[PDB]
């Protein structure tokens, strides 16, 4: 219902969206464009990394999980710098920067 109506943005529907990708997909189907019970890409993209930074998404020591969160929200610079710090994934982060360049 609230995937069709883009409502109840605060309720993460955790009963059915238990994975991270299920959350991203749940919200990107809820973002809106031009006051209550409404979320926009700017709020969502900022809300995610500002409040729930790397710390929240890298506790499982899985780096790509956070990268996908930033890249699939149009925050390409964040995801590039972030992934560029993983000494094992420097190569990959430089190139995804070149492509964007």
């Amino acid at each position: 219902y609230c995937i069709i109506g883009r409502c109840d943005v605060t309720d993460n529907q955790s009963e059915v969206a238990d994975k991270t990708e299920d959350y991203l997909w749940l919200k990107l189907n809820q973002v809106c464009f031009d006051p209550q019970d409404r979320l926009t890409l700017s709020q969502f993209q900022k809300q995610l990394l500002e409040d729930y930074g790397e710390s929240h998404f890298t506790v499982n020591q899985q780096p790509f999980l956070y990268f996908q969160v930033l890249f699939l929200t149009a925050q390409f610079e964040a995801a590039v710098a972030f992934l560029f710090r993983m000494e094992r994934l420097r190569c990959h982060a430089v190139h995804v920067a070149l492509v964007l360049f």
Binding site: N12, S14, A17, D18, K19, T20, E21, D22, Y23, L48, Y52, H56, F57, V59, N60, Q62, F64, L65
Partner: peptide, 8 residues
């Protein structure tokens, strides 16, 4: 309260 469990 988003989960941190990656789709595996």
């Amino acid at each position: 309260a988003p989960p941190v469990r990656s789709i595996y």
